[PDB]
Amino acid sequence: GSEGAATMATFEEVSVLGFEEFDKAVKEHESKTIFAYFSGSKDTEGKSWCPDCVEAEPVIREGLKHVTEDCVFIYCQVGDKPYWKDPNNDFRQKLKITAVPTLLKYGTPQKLVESECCQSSLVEMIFSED
């Protein structure tokens, strides 16, 4: 396969579950841009109870390509459907998550919420601009 990348950006997909793992993967890619995608856990079929995370997955993964910087995506699974509601979760306590799926850009206050997670126009933006 003859491919070509004239100074093209690069992304790294990392699957994790919980805050512990998320932290590990983060610190590992602390040198480069990190992107945490807090979303519900996937079922046996490989889908998130939420109809958004399932429709945003491809919207965020595809956009990540438009990125002009070497970032490191991280699929962080909050947990179960009825678990995300838990207002006493380290996600809403420490990460102070608004509404999942929540795309936070480790380093900048720029984040894309459910709606912003399904909007390719925004996904390709948060990645393009710094």
> In 10 A of CB 10, how many CB atoms?
13
Residue in the block written with tokens 């590990």: 24
Catalytic residue among 53, 71, 76, 118: 53
d(CA 75, CA 37): 5
Please say if 71 is a catalytic residue.
Answer: no
d(CA 113, CA 103): 6
CA 96 vs CA 82, 88, 125, 129: distances in Å: 18, 10, 23, 24
Please say if 53 is a catalytic residue.
Answer: yes
Q: Which are the catalytic amino acids?
A: 50, 53
